[PDB]
Every structure is written in structure tokens, then in C-alpha cells.
Design a binder for these strands. Structure first.
Ligand SMILES: [Mg+2]
Ligand SMILES: [Mg+2]
Ligand SMILES: [Mg+2]
Ligand SMILES: [Mg+2]
Ligand SMILES: [Mg+2]
Ligand SMILES: [Mg+2]
Ligand SMILES: [Mg+2]
Ligand SMILES: [Mg+2]
Ligand SMILES: [Mg+2]
Ligand SMILES: [Mg+2]
Ligand SMILES: [Mg+2]
Ligand SMILES: [Mg+2]
Ligand SMILES: [Mg+2]
Ligand SMILES: [Mg+2]
Ligand SMILES: [Mg+2]
Ligand SMILES: [Mg+2]
Ligand SMILES: [Mg+2]
Ligand SMILES: [Mg+2]
Ligand SMILES: [Mg+2]
Ligand SMILES: [Mg+2]
Ligand SMILES: [Mg+2]
Ligand SMILES: [Mg+2]
Ligand SMILES: [Mg+2]
Ligand SMILES: [Mg+2]
Ligand SMILES: [Mg+2]
Ligand SMILES: [Mg+2]
Ligand SMILES: [Mg+2]
Ligand SMILES: [Mg+2]
Ligand SMILES: [Mg+2]
Ligand SMILES: [Mg+2]
Ligand SMILES: [Mg+2]
Ligand SMILES: [Mg+2]
Ligand SMILES: [Mg+2]
Ligand SMILES: [Mg+2]
Ligand SMILES: [Mg+2]
Ligand SMILES: [Mg+2]
Ligand SMILES: [Mg+2]
Ligand SMILES: [Mg+2]
Ligand SMILES: [Mg+2]
Ligand SMILES: [Mg+2]
Ligand SMILES: [Mg+2]
Ligand SMILES: [Mg+2]
Ligand SMILES: [Mg+2]
Ligand SMILES: [Mg+2]
Ligand SMILES: [Mg+2]
Ligand SMILES: [Mg+2]
Ligand SMILES: [Mg+2]
Ligand SMILES: [Mg+2]
Ligand SMILES: [Mg+2]
Ligand SMILES: [Mg+2]
Ligand SMILES: [Mg+2]
Ligand SMILES: [Mg+2]
Ligand SMILES: [Mg+2]
Ligand SMILES: [Mg+2]
Ligand SMILES: [Mg+2]
Ligand SMILES: [Mg+2]
Ligand SMILES: [Mg+2]
Ligand SMILES: [Mg+2]
Ligand SMILES: [Mg+2]
Ligand SMILES: [Mg+2]
Ligand SMILES: [Mg+2]
Ligand SMILES: [Mg+2]
Ligand SMILES: [Mg+2]
Ligand SMILES: [Mg+2]
Ligand SMILES: [Mg+2]
Ligand SMILES: [Mg+2]
Ligand SMILES: [Mg+2]
Ligand SMILES: [Mg+2]
Ligand SMILES: [Mg+2]
Ligand SMILES: [Mg+2]
Ligand SMILES: [Mg+2]
Ligand SMILES: [Mg+2]
Ligand SMILES: [Mg+2]
Ligand SMILES: [Mg+2]
Ligand SMILES: [Mg+2]
Ligand SMILES: [Mg+2]
Ligand SMILES: [Mg+2]
Ligand SMILES: [Mg+2]
Ligand SMILES: [Mg+2]
Lengths: 67, 217
RNA sequence: UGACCUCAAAUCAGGUAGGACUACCCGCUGAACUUAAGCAUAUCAAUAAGCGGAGGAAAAGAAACCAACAGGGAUUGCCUCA
RNA sequence: CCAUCGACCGAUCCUGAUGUGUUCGGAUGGAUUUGAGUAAGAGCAUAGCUGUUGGGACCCGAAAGAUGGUGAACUAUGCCUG
RNA sequence: UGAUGGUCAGAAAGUGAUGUUGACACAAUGUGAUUUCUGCCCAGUGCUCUGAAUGUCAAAGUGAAGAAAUUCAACCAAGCGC
RNA sequence: AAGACCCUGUUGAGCUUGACUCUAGUUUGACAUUGUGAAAAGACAUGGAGGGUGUAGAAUAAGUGGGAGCUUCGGCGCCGGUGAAAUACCACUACCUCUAUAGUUUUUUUACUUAUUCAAUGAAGCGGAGCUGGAGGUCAAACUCCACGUUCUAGCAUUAAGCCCUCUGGGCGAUCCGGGUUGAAGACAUUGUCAGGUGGGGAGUUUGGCUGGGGCGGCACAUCUGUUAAACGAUAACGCAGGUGU
RNA sequence: UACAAACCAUGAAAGUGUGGCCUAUCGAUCCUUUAGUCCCUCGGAAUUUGAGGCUAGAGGUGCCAGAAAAGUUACCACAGGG
């Protein structure tokens, strides 16, 4: 009826410098409007990414990091 | 309530006579062009209106005229009367867009005689006439020079499709109060032509080929 | 160190109010019996009872009146309107 | 004075002249209609008996309703002190 | 019923009872020591609970027409309905 | 002892209840009490300035009433040709827009405190800032945070000691400033007036007749046919057999 | 029910037809609504709305000459009645 995906804005996720491959990926959220900013409703999100991805090496395949 | 302010228009034609006798100008007299504002109406939606009565004194002091035809015409406007015509293009023309377009854009008023009943909706029609021409009711046993000198006094007041219609006439030769109320003897049509009559007024401006606006209604 | 404004105190100086009467008078408040052959609007009634306040009278009173006439001319009362 | 048939005035209905602010006017002639009328006034006033209505209403009589006041010396219950 | 409270009082109040109180309390009911138990029914009448969408829906307010009085229409709280 | 049972009365009262009609209270809405900001979606109004066609005029009209270099100049020039409407125009009006001034204006959110509301105290220490330490690790230079005299004991603590200046007195001791006593709450409650709901807690009243007592039944209560009805007509019973509100 | 004055239907006509072959099959005041006359009034004078009048229907009273109306009293009262 409305296709709610027309109002989504994409953001990039950056990991801390302790890891090597700091470009974790992308997320989305409802686009920032007058009533609600996208920023405040976006902080506090938790991403679970494999440690092997954050370092390239497969030796960390059995650990997964919450960011 | 009727926004008639004759005493207000007395001091305003003086302020018109300021920039037409005092203040600064070329030297002399010109075209009085006092305006209005006009609100509370609607250019579309409703209908149309018109009203012609010959004003007290002489408006157009240099009225432009072009008398049509030669049949019962001209022979009444020779010698003491100027203008007239010599048909000529009434048999040619009729295929040129101009000449008739030139006649309309040059002179300011024609006539209607008793034979022009043909030419107005035949030789012109969609070519002219209906574009904004008003034939003058003139015949034989009539007032002659009196009713065509009052043609200078014959003002209009028709409706188009714009909320302006702030036209005026006259000249500055008038005495200290020959206008003022002569203009008020022209507001009668503009009153009784609008829907709510004396209500559809948005502003009023005193002005000519000379002034701006001196705080009026 | 003195004005002003507002607010206080005194057994300050001098005054004033209260309470009473009931017949009449100026207001507030306010029933029901009754009548309607029942009864609720109505009626009794803008009355009884209750409260406040005067006087020889009180109140009202010199038009933000009546009129619709050929016009009257503060208030009050009687007769009439009815 | 009685019975009956008529006439006049008002209301209602019908007709609708000269005329005219062309919508007013309403002459004239009618109608099993209608009025507490006219048709040579009869009333006003005082008094009396009788009858009527409102009033306490021929006299006496409720169970009820309302308003304003007086009681916990009996007694019910709490408290205080014995 | 956790005090901006429950239950109750007063015509009102800058007014009161519980209250020198605070859920082992105050207030409102039913049954009626102990023993052993208190089954099925929420359709009705109550009581109670939510209202994201929602039929009904007052005054005020809104919009339109009208010269106005006014009329019509939309919206529409609680409640009812669900 | 003017039956207390029974009936009648257009006589009551106590009590009950979705009988009729109301009502205290309460609840819900609106208006007033009622003020100050910010933001959102937006609408307006006012000040600006600026903007435009499909052809044709190469020339971007969007409007309708008119002459003449005005501004040194003369860039472009002022009706005559190209358009339905004319190339400095002007004198101003009228529209409209899409930019800006920080103007009033509805619905939603959250900020303020002075109205209002709650409470306490013998209105005692409030707000802000500053001295001192404890820290952050200082990477300029002292920014941030914390604290700033009392904890084995059923004692005691009251009407300043001490120091500085000399001024039978002033300052420190006892840091400065603001005189908002201190909290809560806040333009919402509350309160006033109407409006809708709820309201046996309470108020007022009513709750036919006939009738072989009354009640229940029935309707003989408005009525029609035949008979009772006794040969005009009339004639009763909760008499007989039946009917009507279509 | 029989006519009077209209306007009609039917029938060749005379005639008949003013609801149902006859004897039952129904409804005041106040209020509202519709029709009619397009007539009178809104009272300082007018216009247009609005309102009020006059005449005829309808909305209904079945307790049918026409109140707006639930119970209980073994707590009971009064006026009476053989
Ligand atoms: Mg003294
Ligand atoms: Mg006294
Ligand atoms: Mg009273
Ligand atoms: Mg009496
Ligand atoms: Mg009575
Ligand atoms: Mg009686
Ligand atoms: Mg009674
Ligand atoms: Mg009264
Ligand atoms: Mg008295
Ligand atoms: Mg007195
Ligand atoms: Mg005295
Ligand atoms: Mg005297
Ligand atoms: Mg005087
Ligand atoms: Mg007088
Ligand atoms: Mg007098
Ligand atoms: Mg009399
Ligand atoms: Mg004639
Ligand atoms: Mg005639
Ligand atoms: Mg005539
Ligand atoms: Mg006449
Ligand atoms: Mg008579
Ligand atoms: Mg006589
Ligand atoms: Mg007596
Ligand atoms: Mg008597
Ligand atoms: Mg008497
Ligand atoms: Mg007595
Ligand atoms: Mg009573
Ligand atoms: Mg005692
Ligand atoms: Mg007792
Ligand atoms: Mg004792
Ligand atoms: Mg409480
Ligand atoms: Mg108070
Ligand atoms: Mg408690
Ligand atoms: Mg129980
Ligand atoms: Mg118990
Ligand atoms: Mg037992
Ligand atoms: Mg048991
Ligand atoms: Mg059980
Ligand atoms: Mg089962
Ligand atoms: Mg159930
Ligand atoms: Mg249930
Ligand atoms: Mg409403
Ligand atoms: Mg309303
Ligand atoms: Mg409105
Ligand atoms: Mg809505
Ligand atoms: Mg609702
Ligand atoms: Mg509900
Ligand atoms: Mg007796
Ligand atoms: Mg007795
Ligand atoms: Mg008994
Ligand atoms: Mg009786
Ligand atoms: Mg009673
Ligand atoms: Mg009773
Ligand atoms: Mg009793
Ligand atoms: Mg408010
Ligand atoms: Mg304090
Ligand atoms: Mg606060
Ligand atoms: Mg408020
Ligand atoms: Mg209120
Ligand atoms: Mg109510
Ligand atoms: Mg209420
Ligand atoms: Mg109740
Ligand atoms: Mg009762
Ligand atoms: Mg009986
Ligand atoms: Mg009965
Ligand atoms: Mg019965
Ligand atoms: Mg019976
Ligand atoms: Mg009867
Ligand atoms: Mg017989
Ligand atoms: Mg017989
Ligand atoms: Mg006939
Ligand atoms: Mg009049
Ligand atoms: Mg009737
Ligand atoms: Mg009737
Ligand atoms: Mg009866
Ligand atoms: Mg009854
Ligand atoms: Mg018993
Ligand atoms: Mg019994
Ligand atoms: Mg006997």
C-alpha cells in the first residue's frame, strides 16, 4: 500500500582501530524527519560480526564480536 | 457603507492640480487617471456588466475619431466637422488583416450610421469589431455635434477578466471643483455593476498621468 | 542626616454603630395545606414562617416617560380604564 | 302577543359597470348559508326575597403536608473523671 | 485504597471524620467456633478492564448558503454499543 | 373502643423498584481564571525586491487607461513595419508567483515561573561563586569530578576564647555575592458558568371501572345481528347463539 | 335520508350514480402538519423573510363525550360502610 522502503536512509558502520578491516558494513533506519531524528534512534544498536571478518584471518572464525 | 468622500476628493484633485499646476510638470494639463483597488469580487464564476452615461464635462479634450462610410455619412460631417472618410478600402481590403487593424489601433472611435449594421458583423466580425469596438449611435435626425461631443463624455465600464478596472477620464482645465463629483457621477455604474455593489471595493487611488496616490479610501 | 508612599500601635484627642417596638414601610429569602372534584406546569403566591434596614410616614420623584394625538409632560393616591 | 311569508344591516359564496398607480376599484344583480342584529328605542339607578360562584362559607371532624423553633434530667452510643 | 488516596461529612469555605493514621492500616461487605469440604454455569443483571479503529454522539467550536434571523453539513468528550 | 379483619374513598403514610417526574453528589466537554519561550507540519499578513508564451517581433507577457531624450551623455531610443495584444515607455495601478524581512496564526511535543494549588519551619544556613585538600596524567595551564572539622562507650557542650587596628569601639575567628524563607506543583489542577452522562442516596406523585364481597377471570366500558321483548315503539341481567377496530 | 347549486361518468334514452344492497366498521379542546383563500394582521410608515389569523383534512385519545402514571405493608393510619 505504501512500500515502507522508500523512506529508508542507509548508513555506514565503522569499527574501532583495534581491528584491521574497519568497514563492517551498512545499516538502515527510517529517514530523519522533523519530529524524530535518525541519529538518536540509531545509537544503541548492536551488531554481531565474526572476528574473522574484522581481521581477515580465519583463525578468529570461532569468536563473534558485538559492536 | 458607501465610501464617498467628496471633501476628500476636493483636496485630492488639488494634489492632482499640484503636479499639474504646482510642483513639477511639462507646463499644463493632461489625462486624469485616478484609480481604485477592487476586491471582494471574482473575474470568472459569475457574469458580465456594462454601463454608459455621458459624463458632466468634457473628458478626452483631444478625442480621436474615424467616421466610417460615405453613404448617409460624411455629408453630415463636412466643413465645420472634420474627419470623415472616402470608403475606398470598404470594397478592397476585407482580405488584409491590417488597414482595418491599422484603423483600430490608430483612431479611438468609429460610428454606426444606418448602413454600418452590415460592415460591423460582416466586413470585420471575427477580424475586428468583437475584439473591442463600440460603434457610435449616430444617424440623420439626431443631436449631431452635441451627441458626438458627448462621445468624448461617453465613457464605458465593461467587465473583462481582471480585478483592476481603474480607468478614468477628464483633464486638468477643470475648475477647483468641476471634477471631484463629476468622477462621483461616474462611480454609479461601477457601484451597480459589481455583485455586492458598494461592498466590492478594495482600494481607491487619486492619480493622473502625473501623481501617485495621496492617501484615499 | 531628612522627605514621601503604604502598613501598624496607644486606656492617644474627640466621636460614631450595635439593642428595642410592630400597625404601616424598603429589600433578601421562601414553603406547603388548599384549588384544579386525581395530579406533576399552574394555583395558594412572588403570600405564611426566617433574615437585613428606616421613618413619621417610608418609598417614588423632576423622563434614556407616555404616546402616535390638533399631542401630553416629576412622583404618589382615589374613581375609571377593567 | 301568537303562527307564517317577506324587506334592511354584518359575515360567507357567486356575478363583475364606468374607471385605473394594470391591479386596484366594486356598480349591478343573486345564493337549501350565517350573526347574541334593524324592522317608531327601554334603559339606568336604589331596595327586597329567592337562586349562583369565590371567600373559614350552615356548625364540628381526619390520616397527612410545610415553616420556624425546643429537648440526650429517660434512653442509645463514644469520650473524660470517679 | 500508596496521600494529587479510599470511605464518609458540609450550603460554602484558607471547612471537616478516619488521622497523634500509612496495607500486621483504615474503610466496605458476606458467612459465622472446631473438624471436613465448598462442585458445574459469566448466557441474564450487575461490577470491572483496554480503546491502537469505531456505530451513536450535547453545549461550545468549524464550514457553506442567505441580507439577516436562520438552515444544512462535517467534526464531535464522557457515556452507550463493540 | 366512632372494627385493627373485609370493601369503598378520585384520603394518607412507612418501605421497594429501569412506574411517572425530578434531584444533592459525581463524571465528561466548552468558556473564563491564563501568563512567558522553543520546535514541528503548515497556512496567512506585511515589508521588500525580483519572475515569466505557444508562433511571429532573432529578442520569454504574464494588462487595461498614453507621448517624445527625461537620465550630462544619447548605450537603447518615442504611436508609422511585426504580432490577438508593443522594443526609452511610467504616470501608477491590478493579478499572480518560487527568494527574502524574523509580523500576527491552528494541531502535536517540551521548556519557563509569576497566576493558581500542596507542605514545613521559632521562615537557619537556599542559589551561584570562591578558598583548601583527594583524584584524572598533567603535555600548557590548570579544564573535569569528589570532599570540604562530629561513629567502639546511655558523659559534657549555653550567655567566644584568641588574634589584628586603636576608635569604653571596628575586623577576623565564622570566604564573597544575590535579600527568592525552603521544598513540591504549575498555566495543568483548583474555582466560577453552561452543556452531555450517571445518580431510589434523596424528593414529589401516581399506580382505571364494572363485578351476586373483593381478587383472578371476562368485558356485559364504544358497539352490531337474531332471540329473551309479553304482535307499534321502548325495555334489564357477568341472559342465549354470534359479530366489529377490518 | 331527500333536495338545492355545480361539475362529471354511463347509457340510444328515460334515467341512475354524492362510495360499498340495507342494518356495524369509529374520535373533542390545546398543539402540530398539509391543502385552500393568495385573503387579513404583526398596532410610528414600508419591502422582503419569519410569525400569527380564517375555512377543510390528517396526526388520538379502544376507560372509545376523549387524566400523563409501577409495586409492597404480617409496622401501619384516617373517613366511613352492615
Ligand atoms: Mg481617647
Ligand atoms: Mg436594629
Ligand atoms: Mg418563591
Ligand atoms: Mg386555606
Ligand atoms: Mg387537589
Ligand atoms: Mg376535592
Ligand atoms: Mg393530595
Ligand atoms: Mg409563580
Ligand atoms: Mg414575614
Ligand atoms: Mg423586619
Ligand atoms: Mg423614631
Ligand atoms: Mg402625611
Ligand atoms: Mg433633568
Ligand atoms: Mg405623569
Ligand atoms: Mg398618576
Ligand atoms: Mg365593561
Ligand atoms: Mg373600461
Ligand atoms: Mg377596462
Ligand atoms: Mg375592467
Ligand atoms: Mg368606482
Ligand atoms: Mg337574523
Ligand atoms: Mg328594537
Ligand atoms: Mg367550618
Ligand atoms: Mg356559602
Ligand atoms: Mg356566598
Ligand atoms: Mg380542622
Ligand atoms: Mg404532599
Ligand atoms: Mg445522660
Ligand atoms: Mg436512645
Ligand atoms: Mg466509666
Ligand atoms: Mg481522603
Ligand atoms: Mg478558601
Ligand atoms: Mg492508611
Ligand atoms: Mg459472600
Ligand atoms: Mg466477621
Ligand atoms: Mg457451622
Ligand atoms: Mg464449616
Ligand atoms: Mg459454590
Ligand atoms: Mg460440561
Ligand atoms: Mg453469567
Ligand atoms: Mg455475567
Ligand atoms: Mg453540536
Ligand atoms: Mg452545537
Ligand atoms: Mg456557524
Ligand atoms: Mg476527527
Ligand atoms: Mg466517544
Ligand atoms: Mg464504553
Ligand atoms: Mg367506624
Ligand atoms: Mg378507627
Ligand atoms: Mg391489612
Ligand atoms: Mg370515585
Ligand atoms: Mg403518597
Ligand atoms: Mg405508596
Ligand atoms: Mg408511618
Ligand atoms: Mg486553560
Ligand atoms: Mg524555612
Ligand atoms: Mg518546577
Ligand atoms: Mg485550567
Ligand atoms: Mg470547572
Ligand atoms: Mg442530568
Ligand atoms: Mg448533572
Ligand atoms: Mg435515585
Ligand atoms: Mg420514592
Ligand atoms: Mg373496583
Ligand atoms: Mg380489573
Ligand atoms: Mg380483571
Ligand atoms: Mg376483574
Ligand atoms: Mg364513557
Ligand atoms: Mg319485541
Ligand atoms: Mg315490540
Ligand atoms: Mg344528481
Ligand atoms: Mg406595517
Ligand atoms: Mg382533528
Ligand atoms: Mg382529529
Ligand atoms: Mg371514561
Ligand atoms: Mg391512570
Ligand atoms: Mg412479616
Ligand atoms: Mg400479609
Ligand atoms: Mg347488609
Amino acid at each position: 500500500v505504501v512500500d515502507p522502503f522508500t523512506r529508508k536512509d542507509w548508513f555506514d558502520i565503522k569499527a574501532p582501530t583495534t581491528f584491521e578491516n574497519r568497514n563492517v558494513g551498512k545499516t538502515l533506519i527510517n529517514r530523519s524527519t522533523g519530529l524524530k531524528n535518525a541519529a538518536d534512534g540509531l545509537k544503541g544498536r548492536v551488531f554481531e560480526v565474526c572476528l574473522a571478518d574484522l581481521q581477515g584471518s580465519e583463525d578468529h572464525s570461532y569468536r563473534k564480536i558485538k559492536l | 457603507m458607501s465610501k464617498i468622500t467628496s471633501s476628500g476628493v476636493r483636496e485630492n484633485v488639488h494634489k492632482l492640480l499640484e503636479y499639474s499646476t504646482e510642483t513639477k510638470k511639462r507646463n499644463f494639463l493632461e489625462t486624469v487617471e485616478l484609480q481604485v483597488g477592487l476586491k471582494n469580487y471574482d473575474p470568472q464564476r459569475d457574469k458580465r456588466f456594462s454601463g454608459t452615461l455621458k459624463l458632466p464635462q468634457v473628458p478626452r479634450p483631444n478625442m480621436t475619431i474615424c467616421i466610417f462610410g460615405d453613404a448617409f455619412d460624411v455629408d453630415r460631417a463636412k466643413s465645420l466637422g472634420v474627419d470623415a472618410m472616402s470608403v475606398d478600402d470598404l470594397k478592397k481590403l476585407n482580405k488584409n488583416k491590417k488597414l482595418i487593424k491599422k484603423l483600430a489601433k490608430k483612431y479611438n472611435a468609429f460610428i454606426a450610421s444606418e448602413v454600418l449594421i452590415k460592415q460591423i458583423p460582416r466586413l470585420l466580425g471575427p477580424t475586428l469589431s468583437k475584439a473591442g469596438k463600440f460603434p457610435t449611435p449616430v444617424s440623420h435626425n439626431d443631436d449631431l455635434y452635441s451627441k458626438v461631443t458627448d462621445v468624448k463624455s461617453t465613457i464605458k465600464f465593461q467587465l473583462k477578466k481582471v480585478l483592476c478596472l481603474a480607468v478614468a477620464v477628464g483633464n486638468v482645465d477643470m475648475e477647483e471643483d468641476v471634477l471631484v463629483n463629476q468622477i462621483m457621477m461616474a462611480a454609479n455604474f461601477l457601484v451597480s455593476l459589481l455583485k455586492k455593489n458598494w461592498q466590492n471595493v478594495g482600494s481607491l487611488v487619486i492619480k493622473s498621468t502625473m501623481g501617485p496616490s495621496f492617501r484615499i479610501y
